[PDB]
Structure formats: structure tokens, C-alpha cells
Design a protein around this ligand. Structure first.
Ligand code: K
Ligand code: K
Ligand code: K
Ligand code: K
Ligand code: K
Ligand code: K
Ligand code: MG
Ligand code: MG
Ligand code: MG
Ligand code: MG
Ligand code: MG
Ligand code: MG
Ligand code: MG
Ligand code: MG
Ligand code: MG
Ligand code: MG
Ligand code: MG
Ligand code: MG
Ligand code: MG
Lengths: 294, 312, 272, 162, 43
RNA sequence: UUACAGACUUAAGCAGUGGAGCAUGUUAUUUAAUUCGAUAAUCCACGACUAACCUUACCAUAUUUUGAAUAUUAUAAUAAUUAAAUUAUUAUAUUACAGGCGUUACAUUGUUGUCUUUAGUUCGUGCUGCAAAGUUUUAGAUUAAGUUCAUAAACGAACAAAACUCCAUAUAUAUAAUUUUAAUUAUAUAUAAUUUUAUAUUAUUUAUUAAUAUAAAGAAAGGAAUUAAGACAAAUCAUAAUGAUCCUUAUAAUAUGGGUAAUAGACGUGCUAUAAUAAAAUGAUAAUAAAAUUAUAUAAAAUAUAUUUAAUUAUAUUUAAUUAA
């Protein structure tokens, strides 16, 4: 289409009007333009080509194959910065990717909390604020293969809220011990269980429990007695919220099997007074508690 | 589509470092020899010293010699780590560091610019365009030269456990499959936006005899409605994301030892799920892969650094 | 102005960035021939606020250089950020090559849109040389942007029957041309690259043409009418080119078997 | 009213326009050569656009037969002449012809397309000038000179004496 | 490279290949493996 | 130590090798020197895609000594700079050296030869075992073959693939004012198959199946590249490059000539031949190609001589056209 100078003079710069006038006197109005399917001269988008893009066009003053300035008339005298910054926002961050501005600030507890919430539905706040994690076993194991000995890091950890909820988790990693502990912490939260506690301080009576080769003899204790037990059992009691306990381990004292045996004993070897009362149809009275009641 | 657009494929002319055709074959051989010699000379002009203990090594890629009918343009990428004044002040605005002095003799110096000297060597107008790369892992040539020449104290007694870790956290591990599928969806959207524009411009009628010969659909604006420079160009550009990188070492660092570091993807799925077709550079190197080797000399002798990058 | 950077006396009153740009231009354009100037330093001190650089430092930096800045810094130990993480702010060098390709395309598109149309001012109507007054054709060759020996070559070709020679003189002309005349096409072609310049070679062929024509038109002594034209050179050339000199027999054509256009009412109705 | 896109901008998005040949006087042959087709074809398209505005009827780009050069090497540096690698180079060729144009306009075409040439493209131009039989003012070897000098030197004159 | 010290006096270029060679010469001198003094024609 | 499967391995067919002469490489020996490798597969027309001189690395004789480099310090000749000194260039001289096909591929870079494993590794999550560990159906089916498919407390991801490609082929569009003509072509772009469908038969895991045939549609029948690991401390320091060690009036440099071409035996690889399903002549309106080459050139036609009517073959004379669809 041929347009009058008035219309074209309200959209295009004066410097380009003469070229438009000459083209409208050389190309007849009845020209039937054909599309080339061999050579693509024009870009894949529409452009009047009246403005120089700061990125998609050659930089004015920069030397290049098609620079029209004389070699003594270039205007780039500083070379410490990139001449043509990326267009638009200034980045090419893929959709769904985040710029790693800060590195090394993640909290392993928050990383465990986010993953478990997405995989199991547990509350992230409880994991990151209410739970305490304590490593119990940290060693290196090895497998003999045709290529050679392959070492692995093994971590056994216990987590708990100090208010009845405790869990045991194990983790393995061929790379580093930190990865093994992360997996163990992840596993421990998934294995969280509630353990009965008498007066939220001790166990109900005494426990004689056999876990594989470990013989566990645990006795309930008076208030203010403290924890007088194997060091492995001590850590578990701290996480679980047991304050008073006495005990002795016979036969095997393998740390791993003491920890698992203890967790099993606290759940499978205890019976609350309420459960005993209901099962037998009898009333069970704590004499010490009644003595100080109204 | 991919090879018919300047933003979706690498021109085969770029596969060669000397881009020339002369009817006079002897002059072509001479120009080729001059490009190798100047490339060597430029490599010797990159090491600069301010004081005995301030030696700035600029890492330069190989030169791209664009020989047209009227001029020769020497394009190269360079990396420089400004270690002398890397402050937050504007003191650099009141003096020319050594790298600026070096770059200003290429074209700006009015009396002894390197372009005029070379213009007599080549008997044609010559221009030099240095292009600064801010990271050393954006060009395989610069990356290999840096390791070979600057990271020797890290792999001369085996590859440091920290050195390797840094060479593995350079880039976040982008998911090539979703990036490849995002690219293909954008192409389909652009292709379906133009077909809809024409279908509408035809159904609306924008000589019946002439309605069987001409193919002019109508106003350029309507055919390209909603296809501008602000949304089409950056979405179709290829080789925009580093998705893989392998750094190898070899030589004596009393027997030669080779250590190989491999991290990421060395393929492109944009070619599988779409009609887009891959192209081999020099007929043996896939377009996505850029491989370069750099050697240096230590107390024991020669050792080679072989780096390969996969940009999709 | 282009020469402003050479006149630091005239920088006073310019905006802050312009003065810094002129300070950077004088250093880049002079290089080793750069000598500190008071006027230049006076203007740079006026930019101590645009850059927030202490007015004292400016003076040191202006006289010391990079070393001065290293002292102001207090040390020369800057972290080695060679393996720093990528901030998705720059493009790979291979993608920068595809952007350069597109910068070139746009450069040519802009020339075709607004620069080529201006060439229509130089259109000249073809002043055709009459085919009868201008029968000779001189071919010149130019290898653009190259030194090529063949650029000197000039070729001269003319149809003998357009030379205005009588019958007897035309025969003598063709006899004396020998291998340079092709009877089949009637073309007399001679080339010369003996001299170093094409103009010299063009004159040489022209002079030979005048000499050959004069001898052919001087039939006072010998006309060489007894001597028949020798075509052995042309025959040898013909044997090296394949001759497809066979056409479909006319008595085999069956025009009555050709498809007959059918009647289409729609096309017949769409025309009215 | 939308933004008007004039015919000059629109032309860029379509195949280059060609002017009809009236007389058929071939005035120039432009042959372009490259080791790759992409720049060769793009540049050829640009020449047609330049010629149209200059008023030059142009034909082409006619593709001429591609030349193939071949080299066979032995991959090993010293021995093992049984494994040989193949290498090749292709010269791509295009012919653009100009008709019924004055010499001055033809020189403007060559000058402009030379100023804006592409990397790795070569150009040969054959110009054809029709002239009159008789013109006004028209349109010794080093070895021979030395021979005369040598034959006059005493080492040769001492024998030529008769 | 030898012409660069006069074309661009302001800039100080370093020839790493030449510099490497000179260090290897000094090292051999320290190990006693230096080169014998060359005989003079006058002798 | 068992059982599987694969190839591994023969046969058939065509022409050969092994025999003669010659060509060529190697060995051995000789020689002033017969330069040096490579030298089972994976050397032996190999390095070498051309050894009269050169090439050349060897021998004889004669000759050169900071030598081809960089720098230092002097001396000059020269041009600028600066008020005669400075700086530039050049030459000479000076001393660190330069130079070395000298040694070491078993000290190296790089490259290459040969074979072999290459539906396999690692990571994430899940699950089993107190645990080291395992991840289970399965020693799955099928194919010439990862070939194709199915399946299991496993499920994914990522690389090792394959494919996606490129070539060829068929077709379409564009380009050529169809005398640069081969339009029966040239070369850009695009499409096509990893073929598809129906029916009968035989097997099956019998069903929505394979093997088969039959019918129909189709131009459709062949290739390349495509990477990971390891080994022989396999070849190369003689394509170039590096360390160590050795030579420095000589193990460096130049010239003349010679040698690498020697000859008892032996070996590899070729050529020619030992005649009639095969050799030799002759075949001009000229039976029928493709791919290459021509500015450090390709050389037409013609004439002359061998040489005879002429042709043919060889060379000389002359140097047409073309630096090329
Ligand atoms: K001889
Ligand atoms: K060996
Ligand atoms: K697992
Ligand atoms: K034809
Ligand atoms: K010889
Ligand atoms: K016979
Ligand atoms: Mg001639
Ligand atoms: Mg003949
Ligand atoms: Mg021919
Ligand atoms: Mg034999
Ligand atoms: Mg000799
Ligand atoms: Mg010799
Ligand atoms: Mg040495
Ligand atoms: Mg020697
Ligand atoms: Mg368990
Ligand atoms: Mg050996
Ligand atoms: Mg020999
Ligand atoms: Mg024939
Ligand atoms: Mg002849």
C-alpha cells in the first residue's frame, strides 16, 4: 500500500522519509510480492528498522565487519565491561530456575523438613523447631568389589521432641558423612513414634527386653534420680523426654542394636496404668500421687 | 526453520577460523598463513606487567578472521580478571589500566595502531574487535587456556579436592528435558500465531481471475501481528544454556597420569522430539559440542588440558 | 566536535560524563604520546562529585596511574573469582555468534529498507548502442578485492558478417584469421593478456583488428579466392562437445489425442 | 489508524523484485564463490535488491556446478598407512547477470556491493562493452633485454668477431 | 615481538616463551650443567 | 569347577599367492658411506603422494665459529626528538648463549595401530536384612544381532546408546531472458519409509500374535557419521613440541663430489607373460562415460621429420582458445 507523505511523516523520522518517497515512486502499487522459500532475508518478526536496538543491533562506535565508521573514528575507549548487556530483564534465567544469589545458607533441618512435608505431609514447622537430632553411630563401612574396596559412611541418629515423640533413623552415603547424617535425619523423622511415659518422666515399672544379642534391663526411678544408663540409652532418653531411669546392658553392647532395642522396648514392653486397668476391669492407684492429693 | 533462521543455527562459515574465498589461490594461502602468524603474535601481547609482582595475564581465544571483499575483521574473545583495582570506588574512571591500554592500541591509537601495521601486511583495511567474556567457562578455548596456564598449582600434585569441587558447582544442574520441551512449545506457539493471523486475514478478505495466481495475503502488520523484537528473538535463540562440561588432565603432573572430570549432559533432545535437525561442524563435531585443548610445560614436561562444553 | 578531546581548555562547562569521556579519548588516541595537562586535571577535579572520588585521590590517580590506585587500595590481593557461579546474565560465546549473525542480518535489512531506495536517484535510461554501428564486443574481467593476473586479459569478439566487408574481402579476412574464426557461428574472437594493464591489451587487439581489416580490404595483389576456408580447427572442437541434434518426428505427432479442456460452470460463472 | 508499513520496508520481507529485460544486451556477469552456501545466497539476494533500485535488470542467482576438492591423509604421524582419513572442500558458485544498463550505473552497483560484502565470499565480474570497429586513440620483455646486453658483453663479443 | 618495546613504549609486554628459556638457562648454570665457554677464533 | 549362549571357528564359489622374468620393499653381506626407523598378529610400494644435484638425515675433502633467536653493554652510520645532548633505525663488536635427525616413546604432549567390554555405570527415592549388604520376577521372551517386547518392591533421573541426523534415491517449489546448454542439467529449500494394509496357513504366552504365503498401495532397495572404559608401560623424540643427560673449533654451519641404486642366499608386495570361451590389426558425417585438472598453467589446429599417398605413433616448429557449466 502507498501512503501519503502526511501519514508517513507522523510515524517515521524525517531522515527516512526521502527513502520512503523514492520507494513509492519505483515500486508500482500493483506489485504482487512473492515469498521466498530458499533464502530468509527478513527476520522472523515484524520490524520497521527505524530504531537501533541496544542488543540485537551492532553497537554504534564498536569495530566489526560491517562498521561504517573510519578506523580512526571509533568511540569505544573502555574495555572493562561487557559492551552489550542482555536485553529486557537483563537475564536468561530459565522458567522455573532461581538465581543462586546466596550459597551455603541452607539449613539441613529445613531441607529435611521441606522434603518430608512434600513426600509424607508432616508439618515443616514442627520438624525445624520442635525436634532435636543427636548422632549415635558414625562410622565407615566398606564393600570389597572387583574394582576394589568401596567405602561408605554410615550414620545412626535419633530425633525427638523431648515430649514423648522419638524416632530412630539410619543413613548411608558413599560421598561424605554429612550426606549420611542427612539421610539418617530424614529416616528418623519418618520413624517418629510416641512412647508411653509415667508422669512424663520415666517408664512404667521395669523392663527386661531382649533385642537380638542385647539384653536390656531397665528400671523406673524416683523423681530427680536422673539418667543412670548406657550412654546410647542416655541420648535416646534425652530426645524422648525420659528424665529418670536406671538400667544395665548384658551380653552384646553393640551401639546400633542397643538404640534399636531401646526404642522397641519403650513401645512393645510397656503398658500404661490405664491400659492395665481397662484390660483387667480394675482400678490402679498411684499411692505416692494420692498421698499428696487434696 | 532451524537452518533458515540466523538465531537458530550456527552458520557453517563460523566453523572455520579463516573466513575467506579468493579466486587467486596463492593469495588465499598467504592470507591463511598471515592469520596463523598474527594469532601467535596476539597470544604474545596478552601477558602484561605493571611491576615485577603485578603480571596480568589476559586469556585470549583463537581469532576469527572475517575476510570480505573490502576489509578484514579480526574478532576474538578475551577474559581478564581485574585483580589490581577490584573495588566499589570509581577510581578506575581516572586512569587506564594495562588492559585498557592494550585494547586501545588495536584501533584507537592515532600513530601506531595495530590495525594500520596489519593493513600493510595484508594490503587491505583491517579492524580488530575484542569482545569481553566475564566467565572463563563460556568459551572452551579460554577455559582450557586458564586451567593449563593459571591453575597449575592446583593439579600439579593431583587434582585438589577443592579444585574439582569448584569445577563441579560452576553451573546449576539444569533439567535439559524441560528446557528442551519449553523451547519446542515456544516454537509451536509462534508458528501457530502466524497461521492464525493469516487464516483470519484470509477469512476476512483482507478480480476472481487474479484470485488464482497471486499469493499476497495482505498487510505486513496483520500477518506478523503480535510478533515483535521483544518476544520472538530471545525465545528462539539456541545454545543459550550450558548443560554439560568435561575437563580432562594428562601428562606428568615418573609416569604420565590422566584424570578425567565429567559433569552434566553431552547431548541435545531438541533434535529428537522435533523436526529440527542437528548439524556437524567440519562434518565431524556436533554443533552443540565445543572442544578445545591447551598444553603447557612444567618441571616434568608437557601436560594437556582437554575441555569440552555442551551448550543447548 | 571530533577534535574537542585535543583541546582540554574547552572542556570547562561540559557535563561530568562528557569530561570523563573526553579524558578517556585523549588517553586512548595518544597512548605513549600522552602528557598530563593542567586544564585536563582541572576539569577532572570538577567530576569528583559525579564519581564520588575524593578530590585528593583524583590528583594522585591522574599523576600516578594504576600504581597509584593500587596504593589507594592498600593491597593487590583480590579474590580469584575465576570459578564463580553463573548468574544467568551473560550468553555463551557460541550463542553470541548466533546473535552476531542476527546483528548482521538486521544491518542488511536496514540498508535494504532505507539505503537502497536512495539509489533510485542515480537511475539512467539505457542509451543502447546501435547493433550495426557497434558490432565489436570487448570483454573485460575484474577480480574484486584481489590481485589476479587474469584481470589484465581482454577479449575481442565480432561477427564477420557485421564488419561491412565485401564478398572477396570477407573471404580473405576469414582465411587470414585461421583458428580465430568459427564458420559455424561466424564469430571472430581473439584475446590478449600479453601486457600488464587491460587498457594496453585492449588497444593491442584493436590495432590488430585494424591491421587485419586493412589487409583484407587491399585486394590489389592477392585475394586468396583460390584458397578455400579451412575449418579443421572448428571440427576438432565440435568432436569434444556432445551434439543433441535430434528432434521429435513431425509425422508422429497426434494432436487429436491431446486432452480437451472441460467446461466448468463455476469458473464460467465466476467470470461474470 | 495502525502504524503504516511503507513498501520499502515491506519489500524486505518478500523475494527481491526484478526488472524486465527489454533488449537483451548482456552487460556484465557477476560470479560469486564461497566455501559455504549460506552467506553466498544471502549476499546474492542483497545484490538483486541493490540492482532493482538502480534500475538494472538482473537475472539469477543461477547456481553453477559445485566444485569438490578432496585430500586423503594417513591418520598416524609415522606409520600405519592402512587407516586413511578423508577431507574435502566445496566451492559454491552463483551467477548474476546484468542487462541493458549503462556502464556508469553498472559501476555504481559493483562499488556498493563491494562496500557491503560478506565474509568468505569472492566475486569475479566480466564486463562486456560493445564498440565500433574503428576507434579514436585506441581502446621489450625482460629476458629479451638481458640477452642483448649479454651478447654485447666482452665474454660474448670476443667470439662473435668475424 | 622485539618491535613492540619501541612501537608501544608505554606498555610492558612479557614473552613467556623467552622468559621460560632464560629460567632454564639459569637453572642449568646452578646445577653445573651450563654451556662451555665458546672458543675464540683469535686463539 | 558346572551348564548355557555367542561368536570362534570349515565348506562352497570367483580370481589369486606360492613356479619364470622384471618392478619394488626387507633381510643378510659388502662398503669411505651403503642415513635412520618400522620390522608376528598390529613391519616388509611402511614412514615415502616421486632419493641424478636438491631432497639428506650418511661418507670423503675443504671451509665457517655469538652462528637463525632474545637480551645486555660499547662503537659507529642515519633519522627524529630535545637545546649539542637525548631517542629510532641499521651495521659491527661483546657474553649469556644460539644450534644439535645426539641419547632416552619404558620419563612426556599429541596422534595412531590392535583387540576387547560398551541395555551398562553412578545418583535420588522407596523397600528387605540387627547389620556388612541386597533390591530380588529372571538362568523372561524374541531377533542375525539391543534386535524387539514383556515383567518383578521397586520407581525415576543422568549420562554409555539408539535414534535425531547427513549422503544417496523419489517427488515438489524456486532460480536460468535454455548461446557458460548438460533443462536428459545445475543447487538451494521442503516432503517421503524404521514402509503400510487385507486374507489364508502353520506355530504360539492362540490373541488385538509371530513365522509364511497371497492380494493391494508405494520410487523406496544402500550407506556414513553417531561415544564410554581398559589393555598391550604396542608405533612415533624422524611431522612438530617437553624434561633429564651429552656435544659447543663441533655431535653445530656451508660448499664440491660420492652414497642411500652395492649383490651370495632368503622373505613380502606387485607387474608382464606361458595363444584360439584369445591375442593382433582396421573401423571419420567419428558407438557409449564418470570424476577431476589448468596464473609456480592446460595446450588445439596446422606444418616439418622419423616416413611411405594418407592415417597411426613419437618429437620438433608454431602457441589458437581458456584461468574455465
Ligand atoms: K647426475
Ligand atoms: K616399547
Ligand atoms: K538404593
Ligand atoms: K538446453
Ligand atoms: K645420489
Ligand atoms: K594370446
Ligand atoms: Mg593467445
Ligand atoms: Mg586431435
Ligand atoms: Mg569443454
Ligand atoms: Mg612373486
Ligand atoms: Mg650434498
Ligand atoms: Mg644426495
Ligand atoms: Mg638447548
Ligand atoms: Mg647432524
Ligand atoms: Mg533396618
Ligand atoms: Mg622402537
Ligand atoms: Mg631406499
Ligand atoms: Mg562419439
Ligand atoms: Mg596436434
Amino acid at each position: 500500500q502507498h501512503y501519503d507523505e502526511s501519514l508517513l511523516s507522523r510515524y517515521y523520522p524525517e531522515s527516512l522519509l526521502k527513502s520512503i518517497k523514492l520507494a513509492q515512486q519505483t515500486i508500482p502499487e500493483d506489485t504482487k510480492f512473492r515469498v521466498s522459500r530458499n533464502v530468509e532475508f527478513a527476520p522472523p518478526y515484524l520490524d520497521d528498522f527505524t530504531k537501533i536496538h541496544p542488543f540485537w543491533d551492532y553497537k554504534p562506535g564498536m569495530p566489526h565487519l560491517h562498521a561504517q565508521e573510519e578506523n580512526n573514528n571509533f568511540s569505544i575507549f573502555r574495555w572493562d565491561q561487557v559492551q552489550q548487556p542482555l536485553p529486557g530483564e537483563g537475564n536468561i534465567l530459565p522458567p522455573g530456575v532461581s538465581l543462586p544469589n546466596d550459597g551455603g545458607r541452607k539449613s539441613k533441618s529445613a531441607d529435611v523438613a521441606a522434603g518430608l512435608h512434600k513426600q509424607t505431609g508432616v508439618d515443616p514447622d514442627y520438624i525445624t523447631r520442635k525436634l532435636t537430632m543427636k548422632p549415635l553411630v558414625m562410622k565407615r563401612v566398606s564393600n570389597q568389589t572387583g574394582k576394589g574396596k568401596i567405602a561408605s559412611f554410615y550414620a545412626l541418629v535419633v530425633v525427638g521432641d523431648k515430649n514423648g515423640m522419638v524416632g530412630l533413623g539410619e543413613g548411608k552415603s558413599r560421598e561424605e558423612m554429612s550426606k549420611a547424617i542427612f539421610k539418617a535425619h530424614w529416616d528418623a523423622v519418618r520413624n517418629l513414634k510416641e512412647i508411653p511415659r509415667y508422669e512424663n518422666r520415666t517408664i512404667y515399672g521395669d523392663i527386661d527386653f531382649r533385642y537380638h544379642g542385647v539384653k536390656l534391663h531397665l528400671r523406673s526411678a524416683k523423681p530427680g534420680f536422673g539418667l543412670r544408663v548406657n550412654h546410647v540409652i542416655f541420648e535416646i532418653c534425652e530426645c524422648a523426654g525420659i528424665k529418670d531411669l536406671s538400667g544395665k546392658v548384658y551380653k552384646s553392647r553393640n551401639d546400633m542394636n542397643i538404640a534399636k532395642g531401646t526404642i522397641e522396648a519403650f513401645t512393645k514392653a510397656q503398658k500404661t496404668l490405664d491400659e492395665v486397668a481397662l484390660g483387667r476391669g480394675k482400678k490402679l492407684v498411684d499411692v505416692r500421687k494420692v498421698y499428696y492429693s487434696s | 526453520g532451524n537452518i533458515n533462521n540466523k538465531l537458530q543455527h550456527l552458520n557453517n562459515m563460523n566453523n572455520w577460523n579463516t573466513q575467506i574465498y579468493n579466486y587467486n589461490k596463492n593469495m588465499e594461502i598467504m592470507n591463511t598463513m598471515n592469520d596463523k602468524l598474527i594469532n601467535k603474535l596476539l597470544y604474545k601481547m596478552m601477558t602484561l606487567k605493571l611491576n615485577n609482582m603485578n603480571i596480568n595475564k589476559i586469556i585470549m581465544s583463537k581469532t576469527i578472521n572475517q575476510h570480505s571483499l573490502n576489509k578484514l575483521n579480526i574478532k576474538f574473545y578475551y577474559y581478564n580478571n581485574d585483580i589490581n583495582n577490584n573495588n566499589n570506588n570509581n577510581n578506575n574512571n581516572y586512569y587506564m589500566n594495562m588492559m585498557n591500554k592494550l585494547m586501545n592500541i588495536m584501533n584507537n591509537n592515532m600513530n601506531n595502531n595495530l590495525c594500520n601495521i596489519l593493513s600493510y601486511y595484508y594490503k587491505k583495511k583491517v579492524t580488530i574487535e575484542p569482545i569481553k567474556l566475564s566467565y572463563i567457562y563460556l568459551n572452551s578455548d579460554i577455559f582450557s587456556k586458564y586451567i593449563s596456564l593459571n591453575d597449575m598449582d592446583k593439579y600439579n600434585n593431583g587434582i585438589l579436592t577443592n579444585y574439582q569441587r569448584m569445577l563441579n558447582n560452576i553451573m546449576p544442574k539444569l533439567n535439559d528435558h524441560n528446557i528442551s520441551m519449553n523451547y519446542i512449545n515456544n516454537i509451536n506457539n509462534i508458528n501457530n500465531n502466524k497461521y492464525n493471523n493469516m487464516i483470519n486475514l484470509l477469512n476476512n478478505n483482507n478480480n476472481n481471475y487474479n484470485n488464482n495466481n497471486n499469493n499476497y495475503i495482505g498487510n505486513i502488520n496483520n500477518i506478523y501481528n503480535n510478533m515483535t523484537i521483544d518476544n520472538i528473538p530471545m525465545d528462539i535463540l539456541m545454545y543459550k544454556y550450558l548443560v554439560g562440561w568435561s575437563i580432562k588432565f594428562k601428562g606428568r603432573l615418573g609416569r604420565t597420569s590422566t584424570t578425567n572430570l565429567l559433569n552434566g549432559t553431552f547431548n541435545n533432545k531438541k533434535y529428537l522430539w522435533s523436526n529440527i535437525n542437528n548439524n556437524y561442524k567440519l562434518n565431524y563435531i556436533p554443533s552443540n559440542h565445543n572442544l578445545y585443548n591447551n598444553s603447557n610445560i612444567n618441571k616434568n614436561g608437557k601436560y594437556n588440558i582437554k575441555v569440552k562444553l555442551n551448550f543447548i | 566536535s571530533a577534535d574537542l578531546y585535543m583541546h582540554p581548555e574547552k572542556w570547562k562547562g561540559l557535563p561530568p560524563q562528557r569530561i570523563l569521556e573526553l579524558y578517556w579519548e585523549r588517553m586512548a588516541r595518544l597512548g605513549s604520546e600522552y602528557k598530563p595537562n593542567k586544564d585536563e586535571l582541572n576539569a577532572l577535579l570538577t567530576t569528583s562529585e559525579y564519581s564520588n572520588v575524593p578530590v585528593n585521590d583524583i590528583k594522585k590517580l591522574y599523576h600516578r596511574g594504576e600504581q597509584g590506585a593500587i596504593d589507594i587500595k592498600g593491597g593487590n590481593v583480590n579474590r580469584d573469582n575465576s570459578l564463580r557461579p553463573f548468574m544467568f546474565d551473560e550468553l555463551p560465546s557460541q550463542a553470541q555468534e548466533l546473535v552476531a549473525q542476527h546483528r548482521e542480518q538486521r544491518f542488511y535489512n536496514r540498508l535494504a529498507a532505507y539505503e537502497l531506495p536512495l539509489l533510485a536517484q542515480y537511475r539512467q535510461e539505457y542509451k543502447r548502442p546501435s547493433p550495426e554501428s557497434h558490432p565489436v564486443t570487448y570483454r573485460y574481467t575484474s577480480y574484486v578485492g584481489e590481485e589476479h593476473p587474469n584481470s589484465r586479459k581482454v577479449v575481442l569478439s565480432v561477427k564477420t558478417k557485421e564488419l561491412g566487408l565485401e564478398e572477396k574481402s570477407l573471404h580473405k579476412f576469414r582465411i587470414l584469421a585461421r583458428s580465430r574464426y568459427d564458420h559455424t557461428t561466424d564469430i571472430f574472437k581473439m584475446s590478449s593478456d600479453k601486457f600488464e594493464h587491460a587498457s594496453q591489451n585492449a588497444r593491442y587487439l584493436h590495432d590488430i583488428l585494424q591491421r587485419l581489416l586493412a589487409e583484407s580490404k587491399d585486394l590489389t595483389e592477392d585475394d586468396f579466392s583460390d584458397v578455400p576456408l579451412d575449418t579443421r580447427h572448428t571440427i576438432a572442437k565440435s568432436l569434444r562437445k556432445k551434439k543433441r541434434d535430434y528432434e521429435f518426428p513431425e509425422h508422429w505427432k497426434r494432436p487429436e489425442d491431446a486432452p480437451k479442456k472441460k467446461f466448468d460452470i463455476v469458473d464460467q460463472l465466476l467470470s461474470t | 489508524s495502525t502504524r503504516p508499513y511503507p513498501v520499502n520496508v515491506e519489500a524486505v520481507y518478500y523475494a527481491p523484485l526484478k526488472l524486465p529485460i527489454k533488449y537483451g544486451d548482456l552487460v556484465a556477469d557477476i560470479q560469486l564463490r564461497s566455501y559455504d552456501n549460506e552467506n553466498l545466497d544471502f549476499y546474492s539476494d542483497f545484490i538483486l535488491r541493490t540492482g532493482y533500485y538502480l534500475g538494472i535488470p538482473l537475472t539469477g542467482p543461477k547456481p553453477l556446478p559445485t566444485r569438490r576438492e578432496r585430500w586423503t591423509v594417513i591418520k598416524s604421524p609415522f606409520v600405519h598407512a592402512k587407516s586413511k582419513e578423508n577431507f574435502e572442500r566445496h566451492t559454491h558458485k552463483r551467477l548474476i547477470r546484468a542487462w541493458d544498463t549503462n556502464p556508469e550505473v553498472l559501476q555504481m552497483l559493483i562499488a556498493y556491493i563491494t562496500k557491503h560484502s560478506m565474509a568468505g565470499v569472492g566475486m569475479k565480474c566480466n564486463f562486456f562493452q560493445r564498440s565500433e570497429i574503428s576507434l579514436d586513440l585506441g581502446s621489450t620483455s625482460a629476458v629479451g633485454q638481458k640477452v642483448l646486453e649479454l651478447l654485447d658483453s666482452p665474454d660474448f663479443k670476443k667470439h662473435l668477431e668475424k | 615481538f622485539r618491535h613492540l618495546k619501541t612501537l608501544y613504549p608505554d606498555i610492558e609486554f612479557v614473552d613467556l616463551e623467552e622468559q621460560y628459556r632464560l629460567s632454564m638457562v639459569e637453572a642449568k648454570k646452578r646445577r653445573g650443567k651450563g654451556a662451555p665457554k665458546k672458543m675464540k677464533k683469535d686463539a
